[PDB]
Scaffold this motif. Sequence first.
Motif, PDB file in Angstrom:
ATOM      1  N   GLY A  38      61.162  22.895  50.209  1.00 32.73           N
ATOM      2  CA  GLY A  38      60.499  23.774  51.157  1.00 32.73           C
ATOM      3  C   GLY A  38      60.731  25.273  51.063  1.00 32.73           C
ATOM      4  O   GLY A  38      59.967  26.052  51.649  1.00 32.73           O
ATOM      5  N   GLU A  39      61.776  25.695  50.362  1.00 32.46           N
ATOM      6  CA  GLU A  39      62.055  27.120  50.226  1.00 32.46           C
ATOM      7  C   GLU A  39      61.469  27.617  48.916  1.00 32.46           C
ATOM      8  O   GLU A  39      61.805  27.105  47.853  1.00 32.46           O
ATOM      9  CB  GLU A  39      63.566  27.418  50.225  1.00 32.46           C
ATOM     10  CG  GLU A  39      63.860  28.934  50.114  1.00 32.46           C
ATOM     11  CD  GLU A  39      65.329  29.313  50.217  1.00 32.46           C
ATOM     12  OE1 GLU A  39      66.112  28.549  50.824  1.00 32.46           O
ATOM     13  OE2 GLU A  39      65.704  30.399  49.705  1.00 32.46           O
ATOM     14  N   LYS A  40      60.614  28.628  49.002  1.00 32.65           N
ATOM     15  CA  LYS A  40      59.983  29.202  47.813  1.00 32.65           C
ATOM     16  C   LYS A  40      60.949  30.043  46.987  1.00 32.65           C
ATOM     17  O   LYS A  40      61.948  30.549  47.497  1.00 32.65           O
ATOM     18  CB  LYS A  40      58.785  30.068  48.237  1.00 32.65           C
ATOM     19  CG  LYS A  40      57.654  29.257  48.850  1.00 32.65           C
ATOM     20  CD  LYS A  40      56.532  30.132  49.394  1.00 32.65           C
ATOM     21  CE  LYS A  40      55.356  29.268  49.832  1.00 32.65           C
ATOM     22  NZ  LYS A  40      54.223  30.077  50.375  1.00 32.65           N
TER      23      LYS A  40
ATOM     24  N   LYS B 236      65.357  37.480  46.470  1.00 32.67           N
ATOM     25  CA  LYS B 236      66.590  36.851  46.950  1.00 32.67           C
ATOM     26  C   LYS B 236      67.223  35.991  45.864  1.00 32.67           C
ATOM     27  O   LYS B 236      66.554  35.600  44.911  1.00 32.67           O
ATOM     28  CB  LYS B 236      66.252  35.952  48.143  1.00 32.67           C
ATOM     29  CG  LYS B 236      65.167  34.937  47.785  1.00 32.67           C
ATOM     30  CD  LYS B 236      64.747  34.026  48.936  1.00 32.67           C
ATOM     31  CE  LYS B 236      63.682  33.048  48.439  1.00 32.67           C
ATOM     32  NZ  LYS B 236      63.258  32.032  49.437  1.00 32.67           N
TER      33      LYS B 236
END
Lengths: 214, 214
Positions: free
Chosen positions: A15-17, A40
Amino acid sequence: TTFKIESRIHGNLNGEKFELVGGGVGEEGRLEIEMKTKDKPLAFSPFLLSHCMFYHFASFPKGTKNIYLHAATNGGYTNTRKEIYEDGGILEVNFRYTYEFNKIIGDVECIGHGFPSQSPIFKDTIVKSCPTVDLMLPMSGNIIASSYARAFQLKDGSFYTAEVKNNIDFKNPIHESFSKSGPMFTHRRVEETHTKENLAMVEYQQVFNSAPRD
Amino acid sequence: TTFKIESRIHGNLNGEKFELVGGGVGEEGRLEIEMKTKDKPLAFSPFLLSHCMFYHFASFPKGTKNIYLHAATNGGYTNTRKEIYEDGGILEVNFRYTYEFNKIIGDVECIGHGFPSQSPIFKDTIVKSCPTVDLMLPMSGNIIASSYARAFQLKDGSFYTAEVKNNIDFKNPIHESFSKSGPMFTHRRVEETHTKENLAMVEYQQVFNSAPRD
Ligand SMILES: [Cl-]
Ligand SMILES: [Cl-]
């Protein structure tokens, strides 16, 4: 024969790009590439992206033409990979390429899902990607089905494994020199130096079709 | 170094029992074996039994001791294989060995199930077993997990594939020379001459841990 390499890896894991951009150079049997995350650091082990960071740079046995470079000269090809890890994590990767003079630009979409919180990719216990030997089978429709198991070596010396499948889809017929009566193998290994912000790797690939010794 | 080989394969496929007995000889990197069915011809393709017909006979790279022969000298080992074919057929094989002076006796229990009536093993369209390269991972508890895909070549040139896993269980520690930090590979190929009553095969095995070329 030294081609410039350019790549962008994008997608999401659980779920985290994430997104990485970079490049390097490749030649017959060896490539080197460095990439940096955008915005990031990576939320998971950078080693999971080592194999996401160009089949074109493998050396081929005498008598067999490099099918990837041959395709690049006509229509090209795409590669779709699925890695099924022993703890349920699944990594799906689609490789698309565009070519310019003396340069290959990879567009890599990577979707990871089902990795448990306890997975080595989150404990950051992976220290290196072990070598693999792929079985390649030419199939009807200008496709090559590739399969192999792979392992990551962990800090305690144990392994974290996956079963991998690749569907290499060629726009045109695969070069005839690539016998379609039997399978061929590709030995691959990498040398990694990663952080969660900057990934660096050297990769060696060798296509072969006979035992190493006599 | 020429050992005598003896084997008996027994079990059933889709409910019908079968049994073969025979033997041959093996040396470093090569073995030859001939076996005959008992009571009746095989109800399915004899090529499905080629890999059921001795890891001991592989040549090893300089510096690494033959772990199978080393084990035979102490405690020994067993091998348990599961082949999952692309049409749902499953072949489970358990290999047990006993040793006498200069002779290895294999006891092979083979259970096949779920093969559809349309399977190539019943159409008798298989013409040969393609070569494979196995990834071997030393694991805790004196076990080696082995994995590879394999294919049978069919009369029309297409392939019938399976994903294979082997669990090699050693009674004692695997010889230290067999690095437990990384995986090793085994290239294997066979030369088959079969009928549904008499099977014959020559097999070449080579353990390696580096790319074939430089
Ligand atoms: Cl996100
Ligand atoms: Cl029966």
